[PDB]
Design a protein around this ligand. Structure first.
Ligand code: CL
Ligand code: CL
Ligand code: CL
Ligand code: CL
Ligand code: CL
Ligand code: CL
Ligand code: CL
Ligand code: CL
Ligand code: CL
Ligand code: CL
Ligand code: CL
Ligand code: CL
Ligand code: CL
Ligand code: CL
Ligand code: CL
Ligand code: CL
Lengths: 387, 387, 387, 387
């Protein structure tokens, strides 16, 4: 390193930053780094990790997570590759293996400081910069519905034109570790406000004749910054709180559900990530009584519109019907579906990759999520025209 | 202006640059500028203009084109607005009127130098920079098929992946003044190579399983730089040369038609602009004998796919069937259709605006053309799946 | 706002984000917002503020800070204007007054969400992205010297070329609220690694023949994120810790001072901000015994080189000699000067503006600090040549 | 290439574009390409070349210029490397040799289309886009002084603030092949208008208290587009026309010299390139009678200020005094010096490299020229303060 002082190997793992999470058991020799997934701040759920490793330029690092099989979704470690970045801007997949007990990342950093994460993060700064720009567009407003447990705003983005229209609600990231959900919203909003390569596209403009959009890009700001996977700062699973939200335990859902009730709703989408399945898929309310025949017709029609909007989207693989028959209407899409009788779907993207259309370098990532978001506006235009 | 020397008004109109064209009758007083459309270099056709005006900062300029009603398409001046730019990068529409004899631009430039043009230009530098970047993508090659009358290359962009697939041909700008055609290709290619907001989109990638693309972004390089509307440097209308192309008069079509013959063709698109109609529309070969029933079926199916890909596209307005029954197979799409029996269409975009979805600031422009190009890939994916 | 639900005025002030700090006394009516500077997390020092205000689009906001005269530097409120930003990217000054007791911001936000701050912030994300890019340059390494009280890295950026050379040390932001110090380093480093408009400049390259740079862009990471002005997370004033740094109270200075001792030092700069003076100025060790005549000569020579490098820099205004004769060698530049007998200076930039070269729109800001940083490399090249 | 049609090798050299120039003797086999420098359109001077080669991806190209020793400056081929670019945006040096008779480029293009040139070009489009943006800045105006032989504008950029001040004149590219001169002006102007990394820099602003700038970025627009080295479209060497400029033969100098006479002048710079010397250097009027002692003093003082502004600049190497004692006052700087008695210099940059500070990848290029231009403002601020 040219200065006697820097010479030798001095590995340091740190994680005190937005979404950081790791427990370090041991970090002396680069081929013997021992870690544990830290887990959510007030819940036994554990899966999300995000940390910085410095001092390992050119050293082969073998990083073992000891409690991998004790995590929320151990199947999520099969055919999974961790993501890394030298600068927090560009993320790539690294060699990773799982033996049924432990996850091992085997990677040689090319520079002095590298970050590893379960998926491409999406920070509070990015969120605040994005909404702070989006609000300046003539068709956009940002409304603060309330505060999270730790005093972060619950922000609603309203996009539409002056006058009634169908009210389309899209909420994202109830599970704070599913950062793909906020990437997805970013892509969808960019297209709605006409930025970049969406500048001359007329879909948004047509949509505004039929609909107004009510979008929450981040349902769980506290859980995000805390580096949780599935819960808010109070330990609540926001997507089990739709029947009895609480001012102290789940204010995030309290204030949003109050808004949907006070405004109305004609199409609803809850954007999520799935740890296990390497596919993009949707889940509706067909496996529930009270599901009308015209609802089957619309839902079916929309699934076809979405297949036509994006090849990434598919309907062959997904979860079995009684996956959450027990939790019933505690889930957002099930609840909204029932209260409003409209098309109501959960959209789920992979932490691994789209096995149909894989990419060795990036797997599923922010850019692909953002493209899927932009593509879905096409499916909504079809749907709204057809009904 | 602070220096006695610059004081006073000194108006100058110049046009010696790529695509420049104007005749100046008089240019002393800003409210009395008299012009003529110069017309094509070896043909009576006249419509395209492009010139720089300096020295008019803050002066109201009334610019009258005396021969407007003697141009190729005088209907093109009705409900038409000229485009302007202070920097050749950003173009906007300016106040323009037509009394059935003369076109008048009435505009007050905000800066010392402004350009006026019939439509947002697309230069040889832009073309050479674009193809020079596109060629570096792993799925792209650029092939020089031959030379134009004045020694400019006829460049083919080939996009696809390793192996048979459907051969899709898209040619643009046979009429050099229809710069929208090359904007359209730029948008289509950007999406095929995954640039910008197309980075995570899987449509291109799916398309490459079914097709390889053979694209000519500029069929008439000489006519472009010359500031012609409709003819090449030799006076030839390239879109009347498909039956007997000639090495001296129409080499541009000679070399391209030889390539289509030597490679084969399964879908063909000829991208154009229409001076009169304020709509985006397609014309096929249905009004011709030898047009099979399975051809009607495919063409109809594709028109529906394109309406679904872009709201700008429509099928209500267009030209009557016998618009060119006389010229028959001299036109590219008619010829290709007949030689290959495939889907073969002319796509036409407006010099005015899309009357269905107007925009006071820009009318139809490069960005909107580029978006339509990118959107059409969606329609091709549908089509190729369906047949 | 078009939806009965959003109608009315609902003001919310929030501050749970990197560098956020405010106490809200009252926030019901926009013309009656009452605030207090929150003050440092474990120290009586108080001056820094940073908060988000939403719901005030188009409302005149009169925001009064009740304890302004109880802050660390009440003179800092005279001729001072707060900074604001709709997006955290672009910052501008807003109308502000001070009556000797209270500070009042009188501003009408143009959008739904705006942030107000004492000075243009510089976040942990920006820092991590910047160093994560800089490390990839061939002349740069990043070394983690240790951890702050709360486990954030103390990062050293080493810039130079292969071989002895003069060792130049530049440290910034010992007082975490002086974000201008890290802006200054950003500009200096960009030029050293040849980014942007520094790409073809040969100064860096010449410098590397004479010197190697040892730079700490952020001496107080914990204090920064905490929204402190003057102290770290433990309540320590880092610039009083240079005689007896402590592993528990002031590790930031412990590890950096150990590095300077282990590496050596031939020029030292401590980058700071001054709340009161609207001037850019330097302070050296001339008012101390043990200050040699060749030291007076070099320091004088360097001050002249810096005036010649940047008009913003001046030597007329500054602080009187015995400003800190009491604290002696507890201050970094005084200590280094004495231990190494080299040129050692504190450089100070204004929170207000450069009264010599004011700018109504921005006052002193990040861009101006970054330019001063880049300009100072010129002065170092002169100095190093002359001695 | 996957299609029988593209298979085989088909090399094509073309040059019908802005600044293009080459004669092709033979171009069948890639290792046997035979060329000639085409030479200026109406003058025996020959050196500039610029052409596109397609069809050579992955082929080793040996390109021999047969008349290299018959060119204007055969010494210019010693230790010289040609420049290349796949996209006209990024230029790099390629392997080149000279045996005293012929120049040989030995290079293997990595893509299907590559351009080779004597130096990084600077096009009419770049010029028109640049001035079209610069004019919008509050301190800038663009004035069209007249027309070149072929009707291109002679454009003056005036930069300053409202009121007397010293009038500083800087003219560039009298010899159209010396594209470095216009790169140099681009860098100088960007800094004067505060773009990019010059945004927070106060030098421009200080300068505007002392001076107003009168800048001609391109003295020879016709010669540029024609791909000439040394003459305009009429065959005139503009830098021999300062004593008797002519409306038909050298209007470019007629109109500019009239402006300098009508406005006045207190510092003059003529920006050029030198084919032979691999150094940056200045030439003044000291070797001429009528050169006062206070002129020696100022010129000497300014040379020192420029060495201090940029390491690239030097005064050791240059041309001998009687290099143009014969042509006397036909040269711009000699003439202006004599008419106005002010500091008047020719600044000369290399076509090869700066032998003091070489760069294998780029040699001397646009970015380095632009940096030197920006750096020289520093020297002018010193000078203007000192006198
Ligand atoms: Cl943690
Ligand atoms: Cl769930
Ligand atoms: Cl309802
Ligand atoms: Cl499917
Ligand atoms: Cl013309
Ligand atoms: Cl036609
Ligand atoms: Cl065939
Ligand atoms: Cl229609
Ligand atoms: Cl706070
Ligand atoms: Cl201090
Ligand atoms: Cl020592
Ligand atoms: Cl001073
Ligand atoms: Cl030529
Ligand atoms: Cl000369
Ligand atoms: Cl005079
Ligand atoms: Cl020298």
């Amino acid at each position: 390193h040219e200065n006697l002082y820097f010479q030798g190997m001095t590995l340091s793992i740190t994680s005190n930053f937005d979404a950081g999470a790791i427990d370090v058991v041991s970090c002396e020799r680069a081929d013997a780094i021992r870690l544990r997934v830290r887990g959510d701040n007030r819940s036994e759920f554990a899966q999300w990790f995000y940390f910085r490793l410095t001092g390992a330029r050119g050293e082969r690092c073998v990083m073992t997570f000891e409690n991998a099989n004790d995590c929320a979704y151990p199947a999520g470690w099969r055919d999974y590759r961790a993501v890394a970045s030298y600068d927090r801007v560009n993320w790539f997949r690294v060699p990773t293996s799982y033996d049924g007990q432990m996850l091992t990342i085997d990677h040689t950093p090319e520079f002095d400081s590298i970050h590893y994460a379960y998926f491409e993060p999406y920070s509070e700064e990015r969120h605040s910069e994005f909404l702070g720009a989006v609000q300046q567009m003539p068709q956009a407003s940002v409304v603060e519905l309330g505060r999270t447990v730790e005093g972060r705003p619950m922000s609603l983005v309203v996009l539409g034109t002056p006058d009634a229209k169908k009210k389309v609600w899209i909420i994202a990231r109830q599970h704070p570790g599913e950062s793909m959900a906020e990437w997805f919203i970013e892509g969808l909003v960019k297209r709605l406000v006409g930025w970049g390569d969406w500048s001359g596209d007329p879909v948004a403009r047509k949509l505004y004749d039929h609909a107004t959009f009510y979008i929450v890009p981040n349902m769980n700001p506290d859980g995000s910054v805390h580096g949780n996977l599935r819960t808010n700062a109070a330990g609540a699973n926001l997507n089990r709180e739709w029947m009895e939200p609480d001012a102290e335990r789940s204010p995030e859902v309290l204030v949003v559900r109050d808004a949907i009730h006070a405004i109305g709703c004609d199409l609803f989408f809850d954007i999520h990530g799935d740890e296990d399945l390497p596919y993009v898929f949707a889940a509706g309310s067909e496996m529930l009584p009270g599901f009308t025949e015209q609802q089957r017709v619309e839902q079916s029609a929309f699934i076809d519109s979405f297949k036509r909007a994006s090849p990434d989207f598919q309907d062959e693989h997904g979860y079995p019907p009684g996956k959450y028959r027990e939790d019933a209407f505690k889930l957002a899409s099930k609840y909204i579906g029932h209260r409003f009788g409209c098309l109501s779907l959960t959209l789920e993207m992979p932490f691994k990759d789209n096995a149909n259309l894989p990419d060795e370098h990036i797997g599923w990532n922010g850019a692909r999520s953002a493209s899927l978001g932009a593509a879905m506006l096409g499916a909504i235009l079809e749907h709204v025209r057809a009904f």
